[PDB]
Design a protein around this ligand. Structure first.
Ligand SMILES: O[C@H](c1cc(C(F)(F)F)nc2c(C(F)(F)F)cccc12)[C@@H]1CCCCN1
Ligand SMILES: [Mg+2]
Ligand SMILES: [Mg+2]
Ligand SMILES: [Mg+2]
Ligand SMILES: [Mg+2]
Ligand SMILES: [Mg+2]
Ligand SMILES: [Mg+2]
Ligand SMILES: [Mg+2]
Ligand SMILES: [Mg+2]
Ligand SMILES: [Mg+2]
Ligand SMILES: [Mg+2]
Ligand SMILES: [Mg+2]
Ligand SMILES: [Mg+2]
Ligand SMILES: [Mg+2]
Ligand SMILES: [Mg+2]
Ligand SMILES: [Mg+2]
Ligand SMILES: [Mg+2]
Ligand SMILES: [Mg+2]
Ligand SMILES: [Mg+2]
Ligand SMILES: [Mg+2]
Lengths: 104, 155, 186, 125, 51, 223, 66, 147
RNA sequence: UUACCGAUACCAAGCCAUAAAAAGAAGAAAAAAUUUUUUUUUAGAAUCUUUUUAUGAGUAGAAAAUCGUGGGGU
RNA sequence: AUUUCACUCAUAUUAAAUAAAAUAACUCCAAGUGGGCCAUUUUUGGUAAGCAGAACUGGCGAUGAGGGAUGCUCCUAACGC
RNA sequence: AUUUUAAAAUUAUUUGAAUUUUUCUUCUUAUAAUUUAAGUUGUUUCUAUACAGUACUUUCUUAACCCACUCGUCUUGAAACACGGACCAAGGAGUCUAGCAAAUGUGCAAGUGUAUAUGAUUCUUUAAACAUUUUACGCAUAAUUAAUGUAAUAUGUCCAUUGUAGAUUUGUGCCCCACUUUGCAUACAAUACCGGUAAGCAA
């Protein structure tokens, strides 16, 4: 009753510990959130503000699937996971996962 | 150096040629109300109630009326700002304005016009039509009356 | 060049954004701004403006005053864009429905007792997004002690402004220029 | 003059050097705005150094784009590299000047995996 | 609405038409006037002289 | 919604139709008036009497002098007119007060009787208009009739043609139209001025006089 | 030292920047030091009127009550 | 804090904001109150009218206590009771609350404000203003002088 | 009498800032390949984004936004 | 004279124009400034002065740009890139 | 991601008219397309079948055309035959406290501030943080008078003084309108009443 998403955003629009902004080349403010699909500093994409998020991260070596209440998992498998707990965004996530896979 | 109440007033208070004497007895019968506009024209025949040099000519609303005293709200431009000044005068210097009554007449006429319009349901313009462009005219002039002109030689 | 006034740019003399960093308050202002922009019902805009305003221009509204205001129309909801304080001077409190930015605890308690309703701004919005059957009330702004020093300065004739003094009594600004007997007066 | 390349317009390639920075050693080129009466620069006499002004600024749209068309992003660590996985066509990595060689190499490797351009890959190469 | 060019009316026929619909008719009339052969004009001269 | 849209379209079409007819009427009038003038002249010639043409009702005023080194009264007059830049042109309804104002700023402006074609040209190539809530105007070029049909819809003057007509001869709604029109930001003359210091009526080459019949020419030159 | 002791130059200009501020012209000017006796009479009249109004209101209230 | 001080904002300008022609010299107008009644008389007149001169009687040994008498208006008297108790009192026209105004830390009762009609109040205090007393009585209450 | 040259003034167009004004809490577009892959994006940060128009001299001075240095908590 | 009722006064051309008239009022808090100088015109003292002293307005001062070869003030015109 | 739409215009059709008898004659009934709408796209080269070259980018370098007077400074006015400055590096100037002020932020709000000081299961940080005894004082809530002092409608009605403009509302015919309806803040007054002082009376 005292805490809501908008409020949270307001609190942490500036003062985050995931916000990293390029000092050289001023345009660009990134969120290093464990639940950010696109690493933008927007309340409509950030994991801290959004109640339900299903981001794919790298964490420590192996690619990890994160769900929001917080869950952690591990292409077909990823798709299945998405299908299970998930409510365009999915496509984006899939794309991201592909990219992640490429990295070792 | 010398700024008295009647400084630079050799001509402003001086009565006009062949119009000295005193203020006429009928001038005191001029009726005034709480809202009338009034010109302050100083008759230096009556030294009592003499307003300051500046207010001679300038008009203003009457805000106060006494036995023989008339209080007038006169706008004075003071450097950066025009301010209201309450000048307590006598009747001898106070004269009723004329513009106000010009306005009044117009208003009266306008009312009549309005009434007339109503009588017949019509769109009659009331606003004063200022001197605009002259309409097309055909002026009949005989060749006998048209007198030709040429610049005059020097002498 | 162009012979203009202040050249081109149109002066706006008022607040633009709240300087305040109060997250809740910011949220509220955002909400009301949104309301203003979508539904130009004026009321919303006014509310937004009030929210934006500084603390002096949200003077506290006293419960008694509120009651007085409500005295004509009942059941409609008085909205106060500031704090509402209680008044020991009042004996009875009617069934009031009041939306405020802030209730002092005691005032709130009083309202509750009256069997009334205390609404926050969000609640009000939810209830009445067009502000139907609402009545905007303000506290007495120029009743503030600061304002008593303003206007024509004490020294100018017929001015009713409080001089800035140390204390009060004979020894303190009550002689020359304050009585016919010591040079002048006022 | 103006330096068009792509749609990228640069209005003023020349640096604005301090007045008289070329006359006394003690005065560095770093722009300082002249004050005080009789400046000549302040007064904008024909033939002197120009004063930087807001008119010179680049279009809001292409501003911090480099010749590559990518905003430069400084990278100290793999973790930081990661925010640009979904942005390889818009931000280009520069590895911090103070990174040790092994770490730099690692970063470079990561970049290649990501398809992200590195603007300073050759340091300590 | 995003500002586009500002299109010369006097030239850009379509724009002109949009501005003033009757204009087309006027243009047509003008064209027709232009069309008529010079012989007729010459003939008319005599008439004019007479008048 | 679709139905509503259709209705709107229909209305627009109707308006356009109405506009066209109006335009045609105006055209008919213009020629007719000219013809009548000629006839009148002929009549005058025939009979010893003279025919004076009606004072041209409107006057087009173009600035000459700059912002600097100008009296306060003159500046005020300029402001009133809506002439603020060195080559700002505007239409002014010739009156008594207006005339006086013009006289007061005589040495700083060139003015005269614009003629219809010239006016039309001005409207077309240089006609910019104020689109927005009062005191926040935004200078927008006309191009479309729907841009002016919002503000001048109450006064039965939809379309540029109507506006032009109004400008040409002081109709029931001219002042409003003038107000709506942004001050004509004109070029310098393509053949150049004679001399901005001297008067047009001066025997030597000049400008700032009342060039009643050559104003149009000037406008054309600097269009 | 000899100095420019007086000038009214630029003063006008200065005045004109904020413009010659006209009097605010309030509808109800304070009738304090203005014509006595009459003003007290006026006051009395006003009071009477107020009283009458109050009485009327009371009557209305009574009627409502029944 | 220093970082948001204006001087820091003026740092590259020559006169530090204190004027080029009229410099910033130490104590120009004089020291402290200075020429109050001489070169600064006008200011005194306009902002501090009755500053100069002494008025009235001396009072060599004051002792503010002797004269201490905190006031309360009747308007605030019923407020001095808790809400529930107040309600009870309102309900029961039969019983009237006594109030020890001294016990609540006030020495004088003044009469600014209405009191609820009919409701009798018993007021204990050291001082009363005539009007306050009258108000109390009108409502069927009494003032009982205390010390 | 023309013609021409000629400003940081004027006009037309762009871009920058300032001011104001409109207005804003869900979705596949194209190309390259050979019906399916690949290449780009797939926006919604309220002092924010999109667009619009006007405007831009400046000492004394005032304000705002930034920038940097020594240390502190994070 | 005040108050309450009545009837009834042009109004979208808006009680004559015209008006980038609310960029207005008003309140507060302060800064700098309070040596000025020049030009046309009116002008006082002075033989006169690039002299001293004034009036209306514009400038310079705070201001560059084009012209006046050159110039703080003359003319053109005030300046984002 | 629906005002790059809608219309205009144009092309080929289809129905009805018109006096401007016209291969651009106009309106209009319907349908497709196109651009004169609805701010530049296309074709062919070239760089180039290159990893840097002599090309391309850019830094520096002189040239050259045109311009450009030593900065700071006080001054009506400085390039001045006004002063300060040979050069360079480091240091080098509106600060801190007391009380007051307005501004704004914040908490609480007829109160507020826990002052000293105590208390603790407080003791690297702990010189802070927490807690406040199982009617302290400040400022404010009342003013005014030299003063003994006196102290704000006035118990008919818990009601909340009267106007004129005034936000918001309530209705009538979702912003303007023209009425009603309520009358915030505030401006402008008017009254009451309180303290003082006149004046009139006066135990
Ligand atoms: O205004 C919606 C919205 C909703 C919500 C939610 F309801 F989840 F809290 N939160 C939003 C937030 C949020 F508060 F930060 F989450 C920001 C912006 C829009 C939000 C937008 C609507 C457009 C799509 C993104 N959410
Ligand atoms: Mg004389
Ligand atoms: Mg100088
Ligand atoms: Mg110098
Ligand atoms: Mg020439
Ligand atoms: Mg400065
Ligand atoms: Mg100095
Ligand atoms: Mg500037
Ligand atoms: Mg000095
Ligand atoms: Mg100076
Ligand atoms: Mg100049
Ligand atoms: Mg010469
Ligand atoms: Mg001249
Ligand atoms: Mg040279
Ligand atoms: Mg000197
Ligand atoms: Mg010296
Ligand atoms: Mg030396
Ligand atoms: Mg030295
Ligand atoms: Mg140093
Ligand atoms: Mg404060």
């Amino acid at each position: 009753s005292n805490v809501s998403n908008a409020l949270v955003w307001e609190l942490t629009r500036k003062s985050n510990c995931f916000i990293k902004k390029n000092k050289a080349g001023k345009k660009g403010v990134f969120l290093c959130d464990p639940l950010n699909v696109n690493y933008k500093n927007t309340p409509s994409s950030s994991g801290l503000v959004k109640s339900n998020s299903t981001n794919v991260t790298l964490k420590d070596g192996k690619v990890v699937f994160s769900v929001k209440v917080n869950q952690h998992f591990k292409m077909k498998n990823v798709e299945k996971l998405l299908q299970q707990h998930g409510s365009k965004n999915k496509e984006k996530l899939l794309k991201k996962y592909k990219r992640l896979s490429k990295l070792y | 150096k010398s700024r008295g109440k009647r400084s630079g007033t050799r001509y402003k208070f001086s009565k006009k040629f062949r119009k000295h004497g005193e203020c006429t007895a009928n001038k005191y019968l001029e009726k005034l109300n709480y809202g009338d506009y009034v010109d302050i024209v100083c008759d230096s025949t009556q030294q009592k109630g003499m307003p300051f040099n500046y207010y001679h000519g300038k008009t203003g609303k009457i805000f106060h009326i006494t036995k023989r005293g008339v209080g007038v709200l006169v706008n004075k431009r003071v450097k950066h700002r025009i301010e209201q000044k309450k000048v307590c005068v006598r009747i001898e210097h106070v004269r009723k304005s004329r513009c106000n009554e010009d306005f009044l007449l117009r208003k009266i006429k306008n009312a009549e016009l309005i009434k007339e319009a109503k009588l017949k349901n019509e769109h009659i313009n009331i606003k004063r039509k200022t001197e605009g462009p002259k309409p097309a005219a055909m002026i009949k002039v005989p060749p006998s009356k048209i007198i030709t002109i040429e610049p005059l030689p020097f002498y | 060049g162009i012979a203009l006034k202040n050249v081109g740019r149109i002066k706006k003399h008022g607040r633009k954004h709240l300087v305040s960093k109060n997250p809740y308050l910011r949220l509220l202002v955002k909400l009301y701004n949104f309301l203003a922009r979508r539904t130009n019902a004026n009321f919303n805009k006014i509310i937004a403006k009030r929210l934006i305003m500084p603390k002096r221009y949200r003077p506290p509204l006293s419960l008694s005053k509120l009651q007085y205001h409500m005295a004509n129309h009942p059941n409609d909801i008085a909205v106060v864009v500031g704090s509402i304080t209680d008044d020991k001077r009042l004996f009875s409190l009617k069934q009031l429905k009041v939306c405020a930015l802030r209730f002092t605890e005691t005032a709130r308690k009083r309202i509750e007792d009256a069997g009334g309703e205390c609404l926050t701004f969000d609640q009000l919005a939810l209830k009445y997004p067009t502000g139907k059957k609402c009545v905007l009330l303000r506290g007495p702004t120029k009743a503030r002690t600061a304002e008593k020093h303003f206007g024509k300065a004490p020294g100018k004739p017929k001015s009713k402004a409080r001089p800035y003094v140390r204390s009060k009594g004979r020894k303190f600004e009550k002689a020359r220029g304050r009585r016919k007997s010591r040079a002048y007066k006022k | 003059a103006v330096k068009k390349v792509g749609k990228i317009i640069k209005k003023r390639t020349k640096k604005f050097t301090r007045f008289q920075s070329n006359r006394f050693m003690r005065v560095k080129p770093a722009w300082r705005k002249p004050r005080g009466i009789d400046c000549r620069v302040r007064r904008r006499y024909k033939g002197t150094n120009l004063m930087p002004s807001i008119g010179y600024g680049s279009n809001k749209k292409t501003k911090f784009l480099l010749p590559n068309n990518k905003y430069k992003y400084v990278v100290k660590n793999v973790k930081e590299m990661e925010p640009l996985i979904m942005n390889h066509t818009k931000y280009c990595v520069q590895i911090a000047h103070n990174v040790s060689s092994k770490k730099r190499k690692q970063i470079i490797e990561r970049a290649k995996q990501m398809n992200v351009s590195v603007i300073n890959a050759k340091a300590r190469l | 609405k995003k500002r586009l060019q500002n299109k010369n009316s006097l030239t850009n026929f379509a724009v002109r038409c949009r501005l003033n619909p009757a204009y087309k008719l006027l243009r047509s009339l003008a064209v027709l006037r232009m069309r008529k052969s010079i012989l007729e004009k010459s003939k008319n001269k005599k008439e004019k002289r007479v008048q | 919604a679709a139905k509503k849209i259709k209705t709107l379209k229909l209305i627009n079409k109707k308006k356009r139709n109405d506009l066209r007819q109006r335009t045609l009427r105006y055209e008919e009038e213009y020629e007719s008036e000219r013809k009548k003038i000629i006839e009148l002249k002929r009549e005058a010639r025939k009979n010893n009497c003279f025919y004076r043409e009606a004072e041209k009702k409107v006057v087009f005023v173009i600035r000459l002098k700059g912002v600097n080194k100008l009296p306060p009264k003159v500046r005020s007059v300029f402001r009133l007119l809506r002439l603020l830049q060195v080559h700002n042109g505007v239409f002014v309804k010739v009156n008594k007060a207006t005339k006086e104002m013009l006289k007061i700023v005589e040495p700083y402006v060139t003015y005269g009787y614009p003629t219809l074609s010239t006016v039309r040209k001005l409207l077309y190539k240089r006609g910019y208009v104020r689109v927005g809530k009062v005191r926040r105007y935004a200078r927008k070029k006309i191009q479309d009739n729907a841009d002016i049909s919002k503000h001048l819809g109450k006064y039965n003057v939809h379309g540029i043609e109507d506006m032009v007509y109004q400008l040409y001869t002081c109709g029931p709604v001219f002042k409003k139209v003038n107000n709506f029109l942004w001050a004509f930001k004109l070029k310098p003359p393509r053949k150049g001025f004679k001399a901005k210091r001297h008067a047009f009526n001066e025997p030597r080459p000049g400008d700032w006089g009342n060039r009643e019949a050559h104003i149009n020419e000037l406008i054309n030159r600097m269009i | 030292a000899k100095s420019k002791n007086h000038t009214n130059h630029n003063q006008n200009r200065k005045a004109h920047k904020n413009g010659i501020k006209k009097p605010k012209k309030h509808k109800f000017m304070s009738r304090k030091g203005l014509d006595p006796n009459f003003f007290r009479n006026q006051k009395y009249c006003l009071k009477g009127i107020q009283k009458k109004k109050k009485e009327l209101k009371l009557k209305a209230k009574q009627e409502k009550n029944n | 804090a220093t970082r948001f001080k204006k001087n820091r904002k003026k740092r590259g300008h020559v006169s530090a904001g204190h004027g080029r022609v009229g410099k910033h010299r130490k104590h120009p107008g004089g020291r402290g109150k200075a020429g109050g009644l001489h070169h600064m008389r006008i200011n005194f007149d306009k902002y501090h009218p009755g500053y100069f001169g002494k008025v009235g009687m001396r009072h060599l040994n004051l002792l503010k206590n002797r004269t201490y008498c905190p006031t309360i208006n009747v308007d605030k008297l019923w407020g001095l009771l808790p809400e529930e108790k107040k309600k009870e009192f309102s309900e029961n026209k039969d019983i009237a609350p006594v109030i020890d105004v001294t016990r609540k830390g006030y020495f004088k009762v003044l009469g600014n404000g209405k009191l609820k009609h009919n409701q009798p109040i018993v007021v204990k205090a050291r001082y009363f203003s005539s009007v306050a007393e009258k108000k109390i009585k009108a409502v069927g209450g009494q003032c009982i002088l205390v010390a």
